[PDB]
Design a protein around this motif. Structure first.
Motif, PDB file in Angstrom:
ATOM      1  N   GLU A 198      44.949  40.341  43.309  1.00 25.19           N
ATOM      2  CA  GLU A 198      44.242  41.659  42.780  1.00 25.19           C
ATOM      3  C   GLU A 198      43.552  41.353  41.836  1.00 25.19           C
ATOM      4  O   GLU A 198      42.408  41.817  41.565  1.00 25.19           O
ATOM      5  N   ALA A 199      44.080  40.311  40.700  1.00 20.38           N
ATOM      6  CA  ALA A 199      43.088  39.980  39.662  1.00 20.38           C
ATOM      7  C   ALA A 199      41.664  39.487  39.919  1.00 20.38           C
ATOM      8  O   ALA A 199      40.668  39.868  39.401  1.00 20.38           O
ATOM      9  N   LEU A 200      41.601  38.670  40.992  1.00 16.98           N
ATOM     10  CA  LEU A 200      40.620  38.047  41.501  1.00 16.98           C
ATOM     11  C   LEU A 200      39.478  39.281  42.042  1.00 16.98           C
ATOM     12  O   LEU A 200      38.319  39.356  41.833  1.00 16.98           O
ATOM     13  N   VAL A 201      40.032  40.176  42.892  1.00 12.43           N
ATOM     14  CA  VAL A 201      39.344  41.163  43.407  1.00 12.43           C
ATOM     15  C   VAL A 201      38.897  42.018  42.532  1.00 12.43           C
ATOM     16  O   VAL A 201      37.811  42.354  42.499  1.00 12.43           O
ATOM     17  N   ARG A 202      39.944  42.474  41.532  1.00 11.81           N
ATOM     18  CA  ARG A 202      39.322  43.330  40.510  1.00 11.81           C
ATOM     19  C   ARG A 202      38.053  42.843  39.557  1.00 11.81           C
ATOM     20  O   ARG A 202      37.418  43.697  38.836  1.00 11.81           O
TER      21      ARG A 202
ATOM     22  N   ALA B 143      36.215  38.148  44.507  1.00  6.93           N
ATOM     23  CA  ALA B 143      36.604  37.954  45.795  1.00  6.93           C
ATOM     24  C   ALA B 143      36.505  39.460  46.482  1.00  6.93           C
ATOM     25  O   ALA B 143      36.489  40.572  45.623  1.00  6.93           O
ATOM     26  N   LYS B 144      36.103  39.463  47.850  1.00  7.98           N
ATOM     27  CA  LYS B 144      36.214  40.848  48.454  1.00  7.98           C
ATOM     28  C   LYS B 144      37.773  40.665  49.207  1.00  7.98           C
ATOM     29  O   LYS B 144      38.312  39.884  49.336  1.00  7.98           O
ATOM     30  N   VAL B 145      38.018  41.929  49.701  1.00  4.25           N
ATOM     31  CA  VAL B 145      39.157  42.237  50.345  1.00  4.25           C
ATOM     32  C   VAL B 145      38.851  41.702  51.941  1.00  4.25           C
ATOM     33  O   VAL B 145      37.747  42.216  52.180  1.00  4.25           O
ATOM     34  N   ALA B 146      39.603  40.942  52.394  1.00  9.34           N
ATOM     35  CA  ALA B 146      39.633  40.314  53.963  1.00  9.34           C
ATOM     36  C   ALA B 146      40.306  41.208  54.795  1.00  9.34           C
ATOM     37  O   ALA B 146      41.767  41.482  54.493  1.00  9.34           O
TER      38      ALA B 146
ATOM     39  N   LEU C 155      44.488  46.766  46.851  1.00 12.22           N
ATOM     40  CA  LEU C 155      43.261  45.872  46.731  1.00 12.22           C
ATOM     41  C   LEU C 155      42.043  46.511  46.853  1.00 12.22           C
ATOM     42  O   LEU C 155      41.259  46.036  46.249  1.00 12.22           O
ATOM     43  N   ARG C 156      42.036  47.420  48.195  1.00 13.35           N
ATOM     44  CA  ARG C 156      40.886  47.968  48.299  1.00 13.35           C
ATOM     45  C   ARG C 156      40.370  48.725  46.935  1.00 13.35           C
ATOM     46  O   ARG C 156      39.332  49.181  46.650  1.00 13.35           O
ATOM     47  N   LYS C 157      41.558  49.446  46.299  1.00 10.97           N
ATOM     48  CA  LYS C 157      41.292  50.154  45.036  1.00 10.97           C
ATOM     49  C   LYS C 157      40.533  49.181  43.947  1.00 10.97           C
ATOM     50  O   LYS C 157      39.602  49.628  43.386  1.00 10.97           O
ATOM     51  N   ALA C 158      41.158  47.968  43.735  1.00 10.85           N
ATOM     52  CA  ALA C 158      40.558  47.049  42.636  1.00 10.85           C
ATOM     53  C   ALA C 158      39.083  46.666  43.276  1.00 10.85           C
ATOM     54  O   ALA C 158      38.353  46.674  42.272  1.00 10.85           O
ATOM     55  N   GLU C 159      38.994  46.532  44.532  1.00  7.34           N
ATOM     56  CA  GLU C 159      37.643  46.278  44.908  1.00  7.34           C
ATOM     57  C   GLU C 159      36.703  47.313  44.659  1.00  7.34           C
ATOM     58  O   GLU C 159      35.509  46.839  44.447  1.00  7.34           O
ATOM     59  N   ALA C 160      36.882  48.533  45.138  1.00  9.10           N
ATOM     60  CA  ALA C 160      35.758  49.602  44.916  1.00  9.10           C
ATOM     61  C   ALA C 160      35.487  49.662  43.226  1.00  9.10           C
ATOM     62  O   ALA C 160      34.387  49.809  42.918  1.00  9.10           O
ATOM     63  N   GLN C 161      36.487  49.332  42.546  1.00  6.09           N
ATOM     64  CA  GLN C 161      36.358  49.586  41.105  1.00  6.09           C
ATOM     65  C   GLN C 161      35.295  48.330  40.607  1.00  6.09           C
ATOM     66  O   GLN C 161      34.400  48.599  39.764  1.00  6.09           O
ATOM     67  N   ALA C 162      35.608  47.059  41.169  1.00  5.12           N
ATOM     68  CA  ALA C 162      34.568  46.129  40.833  1.00  5.12           C
ATOM     69  C   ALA C 162      33.338  46.309  41.391  1.00  5.12           C
ATOM     70  O   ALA C 162      32.170  46.310  40.585  1.00  5.12           O
ATOM     71  N   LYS C 163      33.328  46.911  42.536  1.00  4.35           N
ATOM     72  CA  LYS C 163      31.856  47.356  43.212  1.00  4.35           C
ATOM     73  C   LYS C 163      31.412  48.519  42.015  1.00  4.35           C
ATOM     74  O   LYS C 163      30.042  48.401  41.702  1.00  4.35           O
TER      75      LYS C 163
END
Length: 135
Positions: free
Chosen positions: A95-99, A103-106, A119-127
């Motif tokens: 999660e920290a990597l994605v946040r 990294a992207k979620v696979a 993970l998708r939550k952390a990813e949307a936020q990083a985006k």
């Protein structure tokens, strides 16, 4: 799911770490993360590839406690690496990597879907923050 204790042996890449698990060395592929390449015949080193590797390394090396958490599906990949969520002092590295936008979620589809929303939550936020790979 349950967290199992482990010991860091060596950080290997942004998406892979070698740990002593159950008293034997074992390499682990971080579940659900897709980091940029750093050692690839084709393409070579992708942008943010070294940064992702540095992040994972620092996170696991500074940790006092490392824990391995297998999901409900297949537990090892074709290269023999264990497929799990890795925690450093209770914080999930995946999660920290994605946040951090490193990294992207696979989507993998082998029954390991427990932390997909997280993970998708952390990813949307990083985006949304246009962080690193999303910049």
């Amino acid at each position: 799911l349950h967290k199992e204790p482990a010991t860091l042996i060596k950080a290997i890449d942004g998406d892979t770490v070698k740990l002593m698990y159950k008293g034997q060395p074992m390499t682990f592929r971080l579940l659900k993360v897709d980091t940029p390449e750093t050692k690839h015949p084709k393409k070579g080193v992708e942008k943010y590839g070294p940064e992702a590797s540095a992040f994972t390394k620092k996170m696991v090396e500074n940790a006092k406690k490392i824990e391995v958490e297998f999901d409900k599906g297949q537990r090892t990949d074709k290269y023999g690496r264990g497929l799990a969520y890795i925690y450093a002092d209770g914080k999930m590295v995946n999660e920290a990597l994605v946040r951090q936008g490193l990294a992207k979620v696979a989507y993998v589809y082998k029954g390991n879907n427990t932390h997909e929303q997280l993970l998708r939550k952390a990813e949307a936020q990083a985006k949304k923050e246009k962080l690193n790979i999303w910049s």
